[model samples]
Target: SAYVYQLKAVPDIFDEISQRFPDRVALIFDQRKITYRELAEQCSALAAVLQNNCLIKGDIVAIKIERSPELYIFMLALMKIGAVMVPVNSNSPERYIGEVLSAAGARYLISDDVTSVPGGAWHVLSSRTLIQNCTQQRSGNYPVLSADDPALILMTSPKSVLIAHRGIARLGLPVPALGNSERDCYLQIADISFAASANEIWMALLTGACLTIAPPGLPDLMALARQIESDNVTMLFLSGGLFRLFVEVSVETLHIPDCVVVSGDFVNPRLFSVAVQAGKAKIFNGLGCTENSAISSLYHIQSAAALSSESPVPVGTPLPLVEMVVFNERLQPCTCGEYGELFIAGAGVALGYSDPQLTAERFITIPYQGTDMLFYRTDDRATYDQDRNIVLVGRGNHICKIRGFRINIAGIEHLLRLHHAVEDVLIVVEETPDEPRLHACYVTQDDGLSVADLKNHLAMHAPAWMIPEKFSEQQLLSIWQAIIHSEAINPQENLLDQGGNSLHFIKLASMVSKTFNLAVSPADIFTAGTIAALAQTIRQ
Candidate 1:
């Protein structure tokens, strides 16, 4: 009914597994098979490389690399050397890279290219050279690490946390229906930046299971479906977006594994039809946060029991030893079925953030049954099902979930406001037939700061995917300029001042009325002549 969860460092168990099955395949990267002993020896080899380059225990190293055998090897190496790892996106723009490294207080960035932190904040190390020097041998004097030692620091933008070896090692501990063996192969498809990859990496490594790394970047869904079928991957981890895409496109042909766990976004019960169609594998809906170490709870989806479209998919019972409690605003426990913010406490919870203020705010120690236990506030609005399963209602703050990645809306708004021309910005999400799109509506005083100008500025700072897809200035200003056929127009100046005829004014008024559904007429445009004046008139 419960588990004797292991409080051990990842490398400690990794060495034990290596000794037990030296010749057994441990990793599969792009069709190349690597054995357990080979993986450990290489990890030791990379440990020397890190040491030779002046990296030491407790030193924070920001690694920007693609998901590969090399990347995974370094994860083990970092643990072996007792250094802290900060896994950042290799393709991140300069500004975001600066933010992550600065927050983690990272001095070194291990990357493949010239990844210099803007204004000389971080020193870069070449990853290709590290791998090339990865000769299988023992790196002596390995620092003895405890389970509670900080091993990884994840900078999830806005907030960053220091995760202990205990948090990861306990996840790999023996648990019911959550076991993996040498007979099983786990395919890892998520970006290393995502917390789900914690399960994707350690779960397979700690067990005797084969860890298969999926090809990085936008993979062709059809080929991916074929790979799963041919490779005989027994355990698969998919985000809701990827799961929906595969089920919608190639569920019939896809190899539904012995077990498939979906997490990182809303799992629509509508997709449960795939379980019925396959009728071979049991699907699981997993829910958790970065603070809770990838998965806090899992719900088993039954093909026969079918769910209604309106019913929220229950975020199931906690894993063995994990505690899930719902608390009201007063910090008192909520009654079963009463709505409250969910709080998670267990071995999987990370040791608070780097900033003391942030750590104090999110991680709280509350007395439970005579013991003070540390719990992470999840900010997930949830209640208990009659069966005691946690039911997720929604998020408590402004966040945009795109394909499982939680993008902070307030963070984006703050960054955009940093621009001199921008006074304010509001991000609005619109549902398209395909997926959700972000529209940027802004307040600016400069007509010179065109949509293209702002787009280019944001592009230099944020990733392309995070940037808003549409801008109000681009559509509205272009329409107005096209009518008068002139670029020289001031927001404060009257509309008729710059080469605009009565005919053009009528067109502008009609276009504004049609576009925003505002009550606009030729007489209105005549009185409220300037672009600024007309917009104010519409606002009133």
Candidate 2:
């Protein structure tokens, strides 16, 4: 019996479901529908195609395609054969896509179009042709699979992490409080490249729920509203940012689904309040990261009246098999109400990144109930409430030090957001000739609002040094923007090339050192060369 429980791989679960509910509709894509029996056949067919194409177990396959029912089918097929699936975002730039492919040493690429790779040995196949060829082929004999086998590689910031088959299986386990069930119809709208997409795919299949694939397009509020009403979707999941956008654009009369889940960012109370009061949907706010699968905890709001105070929603208790532990900087257990770095330990923890050194640093062995367990350092700050619910306190990485005083950039952002005119805010550190200065870049509904007014507000709320030196209503440029901005000076123009001398480098190093709480030095700046590269160093 325990051996049966140990078999928690995606292929095993899908096979079990197909045998139990062969005739039930498993996937609904626009006008096309596929039953569990049909899905299993499709997966088998595609797996055989890969086998014939020389894709052996442990091989890496990169998939780049727009949203389609076939994408999910290919993913399941890859799992059955024990090949690792590296899902490249279809919208990613060629350079970034190539970087991931090179890092993974991908042996085959399944794409709608052919793309060039540096090494030049990998084979490329059109998804359309692959599926068409496989339809007539029988399933090949699959190798014995292990739950610990790497199943998926999901990209984050600048790297990708491998997720084991057990992670997907654990994610499928039902959380009654979150309303996961076979009766529910789920819309798989999240990008397939994201970890949340795993929840959309595996959670539905394992529970025998109908999964409707959204047509390729931006997941804007209007499109999502139309999809929900037309498909009669019962359960929907969105990132907190998208959830707020949907809530803001949706009207009171829109027929919202029975369950709506939001994760990835802090819940916007104002938008959340509107959604709860306007619809019959049971709204749930969840917390998790790429290392912990898509979601580890779930909190379902009972009523709009419960949040009349407009306080931030608690991230809620862990799922049945998940465990949350809060530890101080010294790695000691934090008491209730004491904020500390959050660690997640459970079946959902990922198999760590491709780099073992980095993986060991974050995912460590810890003494648990009766055995040593692997726990992921979430890199998030949280505390347990009296009822044991998690109250998120921004990101641990967002905390920086400046001039011998500790600063919480998120706290500063929170205070700035309290201003009526401010819509959004981002804080960045810039090096001035005199010293490193804090810069506030914010968006405002009313352009008439002055930086002078912002300073005055901060004067009353924050100390003198905490106030930013400059204010602009523009988004701080990302790495892509930096690349574009460099062209004006020169193709290889960097801080050094832009008349930033040794003194300037020292100031820049100070800014980065305090901002990231790292021991950065001037020599490091010279090595990084560009502003974008320096930012990447801070993140590392």
Candidate 3:
């Protein structure tokens, strides 16, 4: 059952939970564990500092701290005072940080000692001193915040989404639907800047669950598995990209949580099978965007047999109170099995972007069954099955005309990933002097495979036109870098070990087939993993 009463603001939810579970372990960070009472005290202490420094209701404050316990406390403290908290990614360039600060009209920047914030008219404050200054101190005259008041500003690169207190409230309820419980220790791996991070932070607080924060930046998957085991984390929400990597590398050693939710991209069915084998964890394939505060649809895969088909795992039905529809170009409802653009309509719709023009363009009111209602246009393409479940096809814009043929780039990418030896894939359309051509870049498990070898393999799997004309080793290296999110790429290294997975194989084969004007198979890429080896084989 959902919460009986309505939660007015973000802080109101936390305040209620702290009262009920004051002595309960509320947060686990680093080597320290803090109780609900302690977290409340810390947040209050920081709130006092913000107030003492002249921070008032409705003022915008930029928070650029890395993943840490203080960031969580500071966020709650800002909510208590009704100040709009703008979260900037710590890894953002100095130029981006300045742009966000100027756009948000930020009066202050809250960061750690290690972060170098641009010095201008904006006041820069230390998160460490904010907590130390007012230990056990509570700010008086906490502002009365409405559910409609903007509490958080999320920058989605070039655009900003303004989420209200009600948006945060929308994320915490229907706890059972998300597999959240007071007894669970929820791991917070997503960056604070992402909307999904709110699910980990607030869901735990409001549901009386213990929240654990992972360190900033990527940690070793092996060490992360150990943390889950030692900390007894019961719930985890991982992006599909990272989840696939986890399935490939750490599932064997990792301790399975009670509930696992994967989102951000298509869920690999083969990877889901690995998770199912590891434990009885209730695996959910969810679909949502930042404009939607919480996940709109959550598909609970009952068994491996459910995913035996080659199709990407279904994203499932909408969560409680959420509504989704597949619409054609004319904005009419799409018949079942007919592909169309997906639209989300519900209370979870965010309060539009900071730019009014952008908001008006995206967030529109259309006639529902009888009356007009607001709907967020999701550019993702999907179709409804007989069961009325939503199955994501790919991005609507991903379809493009290539050499007189209308092709879905994602469809090609999907085929590339089907190979067992491939780990990750990237495809790009290149405009040559002759004509537009498709180029593929992929990382694989084999170090001796070549473009010709992969072409041979792809020849067996795909049509001649679908194959790429030339495969670039540089592009393959770049794909591996993206998978690892690292600058250091080794030509001889095993890309699969460095975040590569089967999803990349098909793309690689497609490229091999296209580039060399020959058929390449996933098997060939598996046999020639390294750049030098593959080039040598092609040359031979």
Please name the candidate that would achieve the greatest TM-score relative to the true structure.
1
Ranking by TM-score: 1, 3, 2
lDDT of 2 by residue, 116-170 (tens): 3233456787888888887554876998888888888876544568887777787
lDDT of 1 by residue, 1-540 (tens): 133445778888998888888888888876789999889889889999888888889999878877778888888998888989988876678787887788888888888666444545667888999888766664777888998899898756567888888888876665575565666778887777667888778878887778887777766787677677766678888888788887888776435577788777776676866655666776788886788766778887776365666657887888756788888888877777789999899888989877789788889999865579889987788888787888888877665676566787777788789999999999888876645777778999776566777777877788766787777634556777788666555333334566456787778878999997888898887786566677777778
Q: Which candidate, 2 or 3, would have the higher TM-score against the true structure?
A: 3
Root mean square deviation (Cα) for candidate 1: 5.5
Ordered from best to worst lDDT, the candidate numbers read 1, 3, 2
TM-score for candidate 1: 0.83
Worst 10 residues of 1 by lDDT: 487-496
Give the top-scoring candidate (lDDT): 1
Q: Where in model 2 is the C-alpha error above 4 Å? A: 1-4, 115-121, 135-137, 251-255, 308-311, 329-332, 398-540
| Residues forming the 10-long window of minimal summed lDDT in candidate 2 | 473-482
Better of 1 and 2 by lDDT: 1
Q: Model 3 compared with the native: what TM-score?
A: 0.73
Q: What's the distance in Å from true for residue 381, model 3? A: 0.9
lDDT per residue (tens digit) for residues 1-540 in model 3: 333545578788888889989988888887799999988988888888889989999989999887777888888899998899898777655655776788778889988853566776689988777777885755568988887788888765346788878766766675555666688888888766678887788778887888887877766677678788778888888876667778877775433687788877665588888887787778888886778876678888878888864577889888756788889888888888889988897767788998999788778899997769889887788888778889988765644545423456665666677766777778888976534678998888765666676665555444444577766557556654554466475444444444356766677667766776667687777776555556666667
Estimated TM-score for each candidate: 0.83, 0.72, 0.73
